[PDB]
Amino acid sequence: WGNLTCPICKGLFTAINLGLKKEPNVARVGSVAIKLCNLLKIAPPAVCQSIVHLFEDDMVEVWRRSVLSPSEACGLLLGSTCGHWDIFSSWNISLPTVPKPPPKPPSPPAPGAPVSRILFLTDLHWDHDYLEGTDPDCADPLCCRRGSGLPPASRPGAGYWGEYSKCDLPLRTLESLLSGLGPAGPFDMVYWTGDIPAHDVWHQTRQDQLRALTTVTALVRKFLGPVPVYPAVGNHESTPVNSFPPPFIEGNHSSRWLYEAMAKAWEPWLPAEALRTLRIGGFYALSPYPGLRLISLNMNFCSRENFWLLINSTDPAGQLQWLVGELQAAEDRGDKVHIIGHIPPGHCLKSWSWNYYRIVARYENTLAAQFFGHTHVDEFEVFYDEETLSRPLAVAFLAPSATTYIGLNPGYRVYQIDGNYSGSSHVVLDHETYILNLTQANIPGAIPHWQLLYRARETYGLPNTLPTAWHNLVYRMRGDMQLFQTFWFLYHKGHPPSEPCGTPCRLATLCAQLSARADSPALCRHLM
Ligand SMILES: *[C@@H]1O[C@H](CO)[C@@H](O[C@@H]2O[C@H](CO)[C@@H](O)[C@H](O)[C@H]2NC(C)=O)[C@H](O)[C@H]1NC(C)=O
Ligand SMILES: *[C@@H]1O[C@H](CO)[C@@H](O[C@@H]2O[C@H](CO)[C@@H](O)[C@H](O)[C@H]2NC(C)=O)[C@H](O)[C@H]1NC(C)=O
Ligand SMILES: *[C@@H]1O[C@H](CO)[C@@H](O)[C@H](O)[C@H]1NC(C)=O
Ligand SMILES: *[C@@H]1O[C@H](CO)[C@@H](O)[C@H](O)[C@H]1NC(C)=O
Ligand SMILES: [Zn+2]
Ligand SMILES: [Zn+2]
């Protein structure tokens, strides 16, 4: 008989579940997994072993509770009649029934108006074990560190301040960055959008991550003193990397250890109501100025690499619904909003990104600026209206990384923003990027000099940095190879790759600038 397949299917996966709770079976999962890691030469055997032992516990639990959960698996295999497969299913948040007011671009600031200067720091990736002179091109995923061994005598080891390879930054190079901020300042606030630990992801204890948090935190408080700093949660803060279980998972394997430690390390910067949200799901809002709301989002809940979302991808932590509430409240008060976060919205899971896109379109008048990092390169994302995908209505600045990883100059970013006064638009007016030219900083017996790399309005001839100016820049760059090469140069913080970026490469790079929503090829219909 056939009437027995559904009972048998569930019986199988219920026992599947119970089998995978026993630690010696988890180890057995790891043992074969390490041997396959070695057969496909994914990495040196030592890291294969480390990374699987680190990942196996959380990973087997996630699979047990999702793909192999009887309701899901028998849904996939046997159809809606037996269970219900809903892994990464589509979902929608609710916009309030308040009418969307008429679209209104920001007013040009009056002459002599207050300008707010914001320092933007992202992707610091301090590698505690960075070791000068070690091999920059080792067989591991991160080199120039303890255990990378020595290079051949034909090439030189890692520069004292960094290296142009898959290498991160020694703490002293981070110290130099903060020490040299004087010329670029003074600053009204700092936005600090994540990635404190290095890319040593095969051996990262909770203590290694907290030391990184605690150490780098203390360093910026030492150099910025009274200047408020607003962090956002990066994907490398936790362990395993990208492992951010949503608050519906409680216990030791939750993110309590990370968010609680952040709340105590960041107490001097964030108010009390904000520390509440931070402890729950690593996001928060506060008011830097009267008339301005800042919202710090945790992009790991949108992230394609957060394997916990296999259990439930629907608006994790209710963060998007919470964001709607705050934006409406801001609209009701006539406030403007800054959003900061780590992973840029265009790189999120499809459903999350589409709801965020819709949220941005709805509150285009209230959102004044958007800031992300994570990509380590200097770029941006343009938002358009939902109705026609052709009227530019927002832009996200993707600031480049402090880390070299990979092959880049260290860099950081400063914004001029319509300042602190009643009626301010609070939009970005211009920005500047500073870099450390490693080819001359690494000269023996040299003292690093952080130099201004460029100023946005000056080099791109922009009349402002409103969304329409950046839309225009992308389409200008489509037809002006010299201008695109400038963008390509700055994209890599002054150290572009040797291989020329030709026609296909250019189109893909330009396309990325317009793709603020994931899996939406239509946004690039005018390029290809
Ligand atoms: C919570 O779970 C973590 C694993 O994620 C446990 O951490 C390990 O503790 C041993 C004990 O010496 C260390 O050798 C490992 O390196 C630790 N792993 C990590 C990733 O930090 C931790 O002990 C657990 N805590 C409780 C209270 O159960
Ligand atoms: C994943 O969690 C979300 C909520 O975070 C669940 O969506 C809820 O489902 C219940 C039961 O039908 C409803 O009463 C709630 O109103 C829903 N909330 C939202 C925001 O949609 C979802 O069902 C969960 N998925 C799984 C597989 O457990
Ligand atoms: C969400 O809205 C879209 C319309 O864009 C619709 O296709 C989808 O079925 C909706 N999902 C839910 C759960 O309402
Ligand atoms: C960095 O310095 C080297 C050495 O003088 C120079 O060739 C290169 O053009 C410089 N690049 C930048 C972006 O400063
Ligand atoms: Zn990142
Ligand atoms: Zn990074």
Residue numbers in the entry: 84 to 611
What does the paper say about this structure?
ASMD is a result of mutations in acid sphingomyelinase (ASM, E.C. 3.1.4.12), which hydrolyzes sphingomyelin to ceramide and phosphocholine. The structure includes an N-terminal saposin domain (residues 84–167), a proline-rich linker (168–195), a catalytic metallophosphatase domain (196–538), and a helical C-terminal domain (539–611). The substrate binding cleft in ASM is created by the catalytic domain in the middle, and saposin domain and C-terminal domain at two opposite sides. Zinc ions are prerequisites for activity of both forms.
Recombinant human ASM expressed from Chinese hamster ovary (CHO) cells is being developed as enzyme replacement therapy (ERT) for the non-neurological manifestations of ASMD, and is currently in the phase 1/2 pediatric trial and phase 2/3 trial for adults. The recombinant human ASM being developed for ERT, olipudase alfa, was also crystallized without any protease in the crystallization drops. Olipudase alfa was expressed in CHO cells with complex glycans. The olipudase alfa crystals diffracted to around 4 Å at synchrotron, and clear glycosylation and zinc cofactors densities were observed. Its refined structure was essentially identical to ASM from HEK cells. Clear electron density allowed us to build all residues from W84 to M611 as well as two zinc ions, six N-linked glycans, and eight disulfides. The same residue range is visible in the olipudase alfa structure, suggesting ASM N and C termini are inherently disordered and flexible.
